[PDB]
Every structure is written in C-alpha cells, then in structure tokens.
C-alpha cells in the first residue's frame, strides 16, 4: 500500500532520464526501506541499478513490498507533466494494476492525477558488484561528461588506461 512523496518532481524526473535512452522496461521494487530498480540493456552489456532511501522522499510509506514493472517511455511521458518543482507522489494498492502519480505544487494551486497501467515483467535481479576492483577513481561528473563527449566524435570505442 504505497504512498511515496518526492518534495520535487525534478528529482525523479532526473533519475528516470538515466534509464531512458538505454533501457525499455524496469521493475521497481518498493520496500519499507525504500525503492530499488534494476534494468539490463538489450545486448546484456549494460545494467542500470537504482537505489532510493526513505531519506530521499519528503514522505514515504510502504508497509508491504510491491513490484511495479513499467514502460519507461510511457512513464516519462507522464513525467513531462512535471514542471520540475511540483510535489510528485506515487501511490499503489495491495495488488496493483495501475500506479497513480500525483502532482501538486505551491498550495491548492493545482492538482493532477495520472495513472500508469503496469505490466508483468519477470524479476531476474542481478548482483554483479565485486568486492575488489583493480582500480578506483572519482572526478567531477561533468569533467567526465566532457571527456566521454569529445572522444565519442572520433571513435566508437573509447579505451581507459590507469597506471
């Protein structure tokens, strides 16, 4: 019985960007301690994995795990109704057929109820992270962003070297 409220629909709008552009569907496991989501790209070379804690919502309540597989392309449409700083709220029932999305902004200003019809997607969660990796680096995300962006002009295959 899920009711999960983002203080600003921008966030979730952003997160779904990550999946869009490289994966069609995604199961969304809701739990009493939050949401996590896994999707594998089509060529099984890329796995997108998402974890969202209770502390990330304005309010969160989900006294029962529930899974919501959904069409991302569908869901994003619904997310354009977003305006970016409105209060988004996901809601679901015991056995869910539709998840309801619910925007509303400053006051009673405006309110907009949407439903996304859910689909049966088979849950094959992967746990592929290793304990030890040869190498680890952090760096400004837009620096990285820039590099990948430039070298993509020259070549289909960027190659990384650390020494």
């Amino acid at each position: 019985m899920l009711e999960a409220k983002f203080e600003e629909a921008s966030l979730f709008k952003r997160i779904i960007d990550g999946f869009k552009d490289c994966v069609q569907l995604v199961n969304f496991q809701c739990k009493e301690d939050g949401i996590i989501a896994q999707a594998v790209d089509d060529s099984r070379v890329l796995l997108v994995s998402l974890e969202i804690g209770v502390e990330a919502f304005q309010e969160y309540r989900c006294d029962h795990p529930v899974t919501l597989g959904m069409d991302l392309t569908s869901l994003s449409k619904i997310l354009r109704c977003g305006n970016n700083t409105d209060t988004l709220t996901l809601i679901a029932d015991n056995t869910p057929d539709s998840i309801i999305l619910l925007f509303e902004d400053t006051k009673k200003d405006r309110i907009a109820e949407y439903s996304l019809k859910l689909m049966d997607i088979d849950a094959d969660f992967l746990k592929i992270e290793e304990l030890q990796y040869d190498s680890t680096l952090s760096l400004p995300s837009s620096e990285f962003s820039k590099i990948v962006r430039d070298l993509s002009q020259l070549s289909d295959s960027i190659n990384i070297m650390i020494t």
């Binding site: 966030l11 952003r14 997160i15 960007d17 990550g18 552009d21 490289c22 939050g34 790209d41 070379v45 890329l46 796995l47 997108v48 994995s49 998402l50 974890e51 969202i52 804690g53 209770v54 502390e55 990330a56 592929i128 992270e129 290793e130 030890q132 990796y133 040869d134 190498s135 680890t136 680096l137 952090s138 760096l139 400004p140 995300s141 837009s142 620096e143 990285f144 962003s145 590099i147 990948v148 962006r149 430039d150 070298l151 993509s152 002009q153 020259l154 070549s155 289909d156 295959s157 960027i158 190659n159 990384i160 070297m161 650390i162 020494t163």
Partner: protein, 166 residues
C-alpha cells in the same frame, strides 16, 4: 551554528558548528557521524588547508560557507583515448587536490594498472547521470564489468558496463 562540510562523493554533510570549536573537534564531529578517522582528514576552504589546533574563527568561516572534505590514503596517470579512422583523441588526467574548490579534485587508488575499452554509445548513455551528482565514482577491473556511480542524497544510481574483449 550551521556549516556544510562537503564530501568528494557528492555527499556534503551539514555539520552543526560553533566558531569556538577547535579544528581537532570538527575532524571528530566528522568521524562521529560518518565514520571518517581523524588522521586522514584534509579540509580545504578559501584556498587554505586547515591546521588541527586552529579554531574555525581562526579562518573567518561563517554560517553557510563551505570547506571541502577530502581523503588522501595511506595505502599516477589516468588516460582516456579514442582512436579510429579520422584521427585520434587523448585526455590525460592525474590525481590532485584543489584548494579554492576541492569538489573539483581527482581521487584515485590504484591496486593494479588497468587497460580497458568500452563502447562509446554506452558511455554516452552513462554520462547522463551527471545531472544527479557533482561527482562520479568509477571502478575498473579486468575481471568484471566496470562500475560507474552517481550518489544521491541517500541512495544512488549505478551503471555496470562490460568492457569489450576485442
């Protein structure tokens, strides 16, 4: 009062500070609530590194300013290349710490040298996660898919991407 100590994982902690708090004590209010140990800690505001004994008043650090928390590690060259038909590209980066604004710093721990190649269409998808975090963590290995990771205020978004064989 309310100061923000930023972490090089995107996580900037709003610690609650008094101007009569010694540096030793910040480094402790840190270790307390986030586990960090006192002798690794390197805090860097306004272009200066912070001396344990000095009180934050000793650095004129008021409410809603920011240091940057950065870890160096008791325990050289990152290279990115693309190379094709029209020509070839090369960006070379090295681990450093910035002073004025350390959130730009490059951290690196290398356990073994790594030399891997990845499809660019995949990386192009991946960098979209910029819009969720200032910084990105990247983990490479010959024995497994490389991890790319943007952290959220409590949580995260991860991309595992397998290198090419040939």
């Amino acid at each position: 009062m309310q100061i923000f100590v930023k972490t090089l994982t995107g996580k900037t902690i709003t610690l609650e500070v008094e101007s009569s708090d010694t540096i030793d004590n910040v480094k402790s209010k840190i270790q307390d609530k986030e586990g960090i140990p006192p002798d690794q800690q390197r805090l860097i505001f306004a272009g200066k590194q912070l001396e344990d004994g000095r009180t934050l008043s000793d650095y004129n650090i008021q409410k809603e300013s920011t240091l940057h928390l950065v870890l160096r590690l008791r325990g050289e060259t990152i290279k990115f290349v693309a190379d094709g038909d029209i020509g070839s590209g090369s960006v070379i980066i090295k681990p450093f710490v910035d002073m004025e604004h350390p959130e730009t710093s490059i951290k690196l721990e290398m356990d073994q040298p790594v030399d891997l190649t990845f499809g660019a269409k995949y990386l192009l998808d991946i960098i979209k996660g910029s819009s969720l975090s200032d910084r990105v963590g990247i983990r490479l290995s010959s024995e497994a898919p490389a991890l790319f990771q943007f952290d959220l205020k409590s949580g995260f978004l991860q991309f595992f991407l397998a290198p090419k064989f040939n």
